[PDB]
Design a protein around this nucleic acid. Sequence first.
RNA 1: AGAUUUGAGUAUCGUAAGAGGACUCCCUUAACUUAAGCAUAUCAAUAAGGGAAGGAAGAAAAAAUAACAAUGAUUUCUUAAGUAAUGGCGAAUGAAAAAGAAAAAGACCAAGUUGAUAAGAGUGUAACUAAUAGAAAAGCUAUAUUUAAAAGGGAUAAUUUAAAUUGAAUUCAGAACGAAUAUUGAGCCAGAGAGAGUGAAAGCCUCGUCAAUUUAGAUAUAUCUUGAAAAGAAUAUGGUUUAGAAAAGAGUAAAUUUAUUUGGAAGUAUAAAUCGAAAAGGUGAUAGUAUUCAUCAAAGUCUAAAUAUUACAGGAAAACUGAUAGCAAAGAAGUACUGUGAAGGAAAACUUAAAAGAACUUUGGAAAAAGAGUGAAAAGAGCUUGAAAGAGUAAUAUGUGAACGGAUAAUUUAUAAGAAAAAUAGUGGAAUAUGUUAUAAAUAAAGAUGUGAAAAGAUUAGAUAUAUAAGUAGUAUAUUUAAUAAGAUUAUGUUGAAAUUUAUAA
RNA 2: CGAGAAUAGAAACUCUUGAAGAAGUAAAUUAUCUACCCGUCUUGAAACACGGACCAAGGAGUCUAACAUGGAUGCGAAUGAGAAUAGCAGGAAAGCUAUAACAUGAAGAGAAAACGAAAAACUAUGAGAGUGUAGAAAUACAUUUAGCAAUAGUAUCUUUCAA
RNA 3: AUAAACAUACUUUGAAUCGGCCAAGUCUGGUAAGCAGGACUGGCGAUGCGGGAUGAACCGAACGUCGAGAUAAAGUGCCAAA
RNA 4: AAAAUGAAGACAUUUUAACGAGUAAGGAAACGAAAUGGCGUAAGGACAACAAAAGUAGUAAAGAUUUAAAGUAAUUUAGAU
RNA 5: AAGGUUCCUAAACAACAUUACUUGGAUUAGGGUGAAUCGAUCCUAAAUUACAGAUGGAAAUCCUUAAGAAA
RNA 6: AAAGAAUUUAAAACAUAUUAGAUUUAUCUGAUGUGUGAGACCGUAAGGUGAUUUCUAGUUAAUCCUUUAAUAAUAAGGCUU
RNA 7: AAUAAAAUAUUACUUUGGAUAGUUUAGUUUCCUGGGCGAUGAAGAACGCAAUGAAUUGCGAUAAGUGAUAGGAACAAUAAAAUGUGAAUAUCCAAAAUUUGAAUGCUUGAAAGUAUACUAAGGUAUAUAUGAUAUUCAAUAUCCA
Lengths: 266, 210, 148
Amino acid sequence: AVSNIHFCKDWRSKVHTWFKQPFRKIRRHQTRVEKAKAVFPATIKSLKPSVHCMNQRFNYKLRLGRGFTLKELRAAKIDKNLARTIGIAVDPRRKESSKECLNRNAQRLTEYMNRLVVLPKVHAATAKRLVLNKKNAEAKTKKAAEIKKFIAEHNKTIKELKIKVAAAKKDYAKELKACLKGLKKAQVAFAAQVAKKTKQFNKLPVQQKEAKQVLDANKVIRLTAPCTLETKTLTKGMKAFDAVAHLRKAKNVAKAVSGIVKGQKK
Amino acid sequence: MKFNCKVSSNPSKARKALYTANASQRALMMSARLSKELREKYNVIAIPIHKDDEVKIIKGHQKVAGKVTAVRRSKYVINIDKLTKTKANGQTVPIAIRPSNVIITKLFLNKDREALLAKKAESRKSYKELVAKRNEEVAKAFTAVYPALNMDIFGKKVEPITEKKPIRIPSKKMAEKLMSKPTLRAYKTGIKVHKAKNAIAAYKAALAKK
Amino acid sequence: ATRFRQTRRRRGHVSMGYGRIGKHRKQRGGRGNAGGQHHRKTWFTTFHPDYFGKHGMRVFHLKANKYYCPSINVDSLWSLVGKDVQAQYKNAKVGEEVPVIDCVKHGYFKVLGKGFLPKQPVIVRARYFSEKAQQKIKAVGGACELTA
RNA sequence: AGAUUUGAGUAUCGUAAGAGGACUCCCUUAACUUAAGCAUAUCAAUAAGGGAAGGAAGAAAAAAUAACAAUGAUUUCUUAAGUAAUGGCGAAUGAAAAAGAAAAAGACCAAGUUGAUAAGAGUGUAACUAAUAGAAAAGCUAUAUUUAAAAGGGAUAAUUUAAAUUGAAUUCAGAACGAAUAUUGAGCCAGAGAGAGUGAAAGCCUCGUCAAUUUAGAUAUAUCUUGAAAAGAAUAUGGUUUAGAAAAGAGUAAAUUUAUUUGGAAGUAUAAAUCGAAAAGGUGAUAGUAUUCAUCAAAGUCUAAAUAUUACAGGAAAACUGAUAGCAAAGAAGUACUGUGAAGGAAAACUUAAAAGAACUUUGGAAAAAGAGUGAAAAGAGCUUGAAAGAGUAAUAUGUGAACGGAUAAUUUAUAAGAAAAAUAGUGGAAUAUGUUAUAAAUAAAGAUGUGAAAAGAUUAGAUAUAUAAGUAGUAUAUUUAAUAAGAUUAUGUUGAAAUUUAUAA
RNA sequence: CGAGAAUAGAAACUCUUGAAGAAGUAAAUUAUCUACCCGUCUUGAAACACGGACCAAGGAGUCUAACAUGGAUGCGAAUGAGAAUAGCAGGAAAGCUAUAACAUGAAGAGAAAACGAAAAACUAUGAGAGUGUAGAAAUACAUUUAGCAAUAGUAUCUUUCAA
RNA sequence: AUAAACAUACUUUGAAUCGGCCAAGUCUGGUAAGCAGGACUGGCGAUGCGGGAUGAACCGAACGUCGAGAUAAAGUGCCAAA
RNA sequence: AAAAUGAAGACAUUUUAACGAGUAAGGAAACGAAAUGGCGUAAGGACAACAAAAGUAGUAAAGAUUUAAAGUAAUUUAGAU
RNA sequence: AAGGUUCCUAAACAACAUUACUUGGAUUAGGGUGAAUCGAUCCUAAAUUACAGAUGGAAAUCCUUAAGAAA
RNA sequence: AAAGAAUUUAAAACAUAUUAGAUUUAUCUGAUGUGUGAGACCGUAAGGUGAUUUCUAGUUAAUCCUUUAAUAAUAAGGCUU
RNA sequence: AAUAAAAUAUUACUUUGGAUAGUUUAGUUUCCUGGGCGAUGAAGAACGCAAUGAAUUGCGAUAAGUGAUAGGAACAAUAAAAUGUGAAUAUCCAAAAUUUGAAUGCUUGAAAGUAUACUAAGGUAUAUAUGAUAUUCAAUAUCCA
């Protein structure tokens, strides 16, 4: 075998040896511990998006990105000026890539805000926010009395249909054709009725609780739910669908655009 | 084992610090033990030696008792007026003695040995009350698990377990086939030697009975 | 282990196993692949007969991710879900639930047709398919799906 | 004369220089070497020469990748990868996006706007200023939403750094030695059996070591006080009457040529000569024009963290060397010594436990010698041991132009093998052999197949409490309420191999 | 006279020397036979070929990186993941654990575009297993059956202008 | 016909080597050469032993350490066994 | 090389048969019937008086000089000083 | 000029001056160099080197009164 | 001529219309609006309709591969001789 | 034929030499923490200082050491003196710190020196480039009575 060894230069001055490796671990770990003691939600490794990888080789996988776009913050009802102060990464450089990316990272932020517990800026019980919460507490009781009447009268026609689907599927696992059709028909009707204004910003969850200290919010909010075995019903259409000619028609359509343009100028 | 990372367990570095130690650290090194009469009066084990003290040599050719006439810290030795040797032409020269071969039998306490002895005495007591608090805490845990026993069992004789329950394991047949020749030959010889010793013991017992 | 080298066995031999007539000198015909066309031409002709020359067109910047396409034959499709699932849906046919093999989710993009499939209906989802791959899947009573 | 511009002298308060340069940022067109010659190429951002820095430095917030179900400052590690590419396409040279981690942080000038404009600038200070990316000022306002009187002081606690203190258990007994730590016997401590010293080998003689204490120094670490908890202020989307009806980096980007460089190949980067933009434009690495598409918005600045280190200082370790070894240097070693100079550059460890380093007599000019004495022992300072080469003394043996070696015997010397004992015929059987029993021990099971329990959890459906919430069973946490699916782990039945081989006592 | 065979018969000893030194061995000398200077280049050196005055200590196939064959080892369509890195007890350059990016392999041909493997194979000789007879000690024949590895040759299929 | 089962067929990995020299019921150039160059085989190199007094190649014959015999080349007046 | 025996003896088993010259060069370790067998230098991890004081050592270590013994050899062992 | 205590004296002869030495430029210990007038110091010769200026990527080079609000 | 549901709620680019202001220059700056660009087929009645793909018959066009966002005519590079 | 003077060989003892063995206050490598110089004069060089010192060590005309704070009875080769009313010893402290050296008033060869100002002798300041402020000036350079 023809050898290709690049040792004709002074590799002896190019040799890097890793004798410091067992002490990088001790350095980084100790500093990582020191950060947690100083202010624990700083080593919290502030929350990050769920963004797809690039190229067709990786595009089916999800991974953490850097920062939520300004549109995802608005959808989740968080001010971008307050996001950086409560352990949220913000990346104005990120262009929104799709609606599904906008929806998925909007769910991530809403779930994070529910698990979030912001302590008062001033530890004293005479803090203005704590006082303000007492002042508007009676208004919340009136307001929350209306938030419950809604979403208890509007999402009731689908709840029975949704309940019936679970019961019918449970009975099948022990029909679904008409059970799922009814839910689908109601869903389109529901989607036709929403087509009206919601608050710009939500409230910061502020209270006084015993400090349970968690070193990262990214490992609590998982990127991807575990994958099960998907199963599907065989129909006559699935058998009929001939996939090869769809691939070859799609390829030949794109390769004939040269012939179309050439024949036009003639 | 030593768990302090500042101190070194290197013999060469230990000797170098001994040769190059200053006078302050040389005084605290040349210490001698108090005698029974002095130990009972002061409750102090050992103190650094001093001139005009009276000591008693316990190791060496001559176990004389004299007075400290010279505390030579550069040589790490002391001198006694009673241990001398005649230097041929007639004059006598003192014989150097290591301070760890003598015990003090009469102090020379002017004003600061008195303060040191009081400090040395209270340190002994303060540590004793701390060890007592630990031992009680250790004993309080032992009576919580074995309420019928007392801690004095650890200082008395121990009776071994004489039960000899054997275990069947399907590897004892392979034991002889899992040793190398050097350890197999030694193992077999130990069996042969042990058997012959038992044979002689059996023959002796038969003669003794008969 | 330097005690198992040949130097320990050649102690006492003058030449250390390198010859008296032809000594062990610094070089034996050049440094590296020197003389590829002059005196080691019989070596390159014998053992690397296409070493010198040019073939094919240059790709100034090759996008090696565009050629990535893991492949799986038809006979290996059922191993993605295991034999326990394979026997569980063994007696299925048109009308009821049939397992879906997500080739892409397992890292396989193209499905090729080689060997024989078990006689059970199955739904194969992948990015690319071969002519004989789809024929064998359809001849067994199954379907093919596209992705991406 | 006076108002400015420009340039000097002097005075005051400061600033630069030099050392070091291991790591960091750069300037410069080395050659030996490889190509079996050699001239491009390689050696090679390599040697030497030169400049500038800090505890790190450099870089850093897209005129960036990609063509995707797309990402998103910089830096460093893994992989891509000896791959694309470059090359007398020879020898050889050779990246980067993607992907996985360590760490994470973003802010400013210029230009534009506001102009009863603000001791120094009006040739302009100051204030506002960007991804819904035509901003910018004054006053009203609606909705969400953030919000204790900041900063600086004082105190305690916690986390750390250093110093000091403390820190167990035979001052045990016998024998013997110049000497006990060794040896014999009897004990004890141990969160301490790492190590050093001690006439000689020590867990218990000293110093330390394990567990600790105290005192000082910081943290942008929390609490309480100063400190009132108010007035207000702040973020974003609107409406309203005025004010205004913009800007976005020029000898720069790019172009022709030359030279170096690059994996970058009809030009990747830098520089020089010439030329030189914009009602913008750059990139999509095969030159050109056109039409679409995608993605950024150059020509000013700053920015912690992850990273490097064989200067030097302080420490800790070692399957490293043990005085021709390891640094050149284990002693007054970059010393002695050489050279006009740049520069070159060694050798040399050990008496004894303790100098107790002979001390007085005789001979000799003296050095010394012989006695004498010290010491366990001269080990006597040219001092632990003391080899070979070379000598001297003693003992033994041999002999005509070499000597040595080998086989075989003779002579001389040395080494060196032993205490039992015969035949026949009265007693006397003694280990052992045979087989008879008794005992002891060892030696047969790999599996297969049934029936339960079960922790931490998962899902689903309710309840309570808290927070936040008006659109396809709200969401999240804590405690329970039932139910289904599995469950690591785990308990116990059935099934299925003996009858031999040694030792012991008659 | 006499082979085979059946039947009966018979072998246990002497001398000398040796702790006053046997047998053997060693050293020195003598005597017969025998013996050119080692290392190296070379067709050929004891060579009038070169190095060697003598002695002591030092003294020369090693280390890092890529590939291949081969012998022992683990796992096996997977192997490795002591990739970085992240955790655990113990205080630790040691040890243990991380459903994981990737490396090599499971698919091959083409410069590239574009593609991407069965007639559930065939033939030949071949490893092994039985039954019977006999020699008669082992073993030697007759016959029934299976045909793995290996080699060679066939159809069939993927890619290439071309296998 | 004769021989051949520690037969036969090999596969993989690799060392050293390709300065040669001698003999002859052989040849070529040359007056000739212990010269130069070739065909076939055997040797020396890599090889000691017995004989030719001595010798790289000649003749006999190839070697673990020994004892006893029959031999080979060649010898039997003495050196020297006959 | 072939037969026989084979958990441990021991001398790397027992028997029979054939063989043994050699420069350059090769035969790494392990492999019970062992796919060559061994000696020596130094360091690291274990083992070394099996009954609770467990290799040797001031009743003389290492080293040096010699005398003898074992081994074909590399070398090892012991005595005396 | 170069050397550097070799100068003088005393004690002493282990080493060194190719024998020896009671001698010595050798060992040890002391002592010794006095300037208004002699020289250096002052001036300039061949020549040499600064601030500013000029040149250079750099180290640095050139200029010595020309280029300077300098001397 | 023969088979053919197509997967399921959070949205911005602006081609524009139509207005509120400013401007004269190669004119711009906000907001309102529909489509674009949208995809849950009608079934408890057997299932039809229907995008999209297949075969056959004429038509016009392109046709060795590449310059890696897509084409074109030039240019350049590949493959065989 | 004879000699063993010389020569040779073995062992014991002694000698020249320093191998071997035992040993280490020295090195080498890796890792952790820092990476803390200078016009307030650094690093380097020179000279001087101990009761008896030549080197070396420490130090600077206050000299092998001064004050202060800790520290508790020594040093020693030989004398002295001091010393629990405080000896050794330790130091990121205080005072002090000669001639030079970037070297910086001018000069410097191995050069001895020397000018001015302020407070005879002593001590300070005065190099080059440079920022801000103050003051004095120069040029019709632009206006201008």
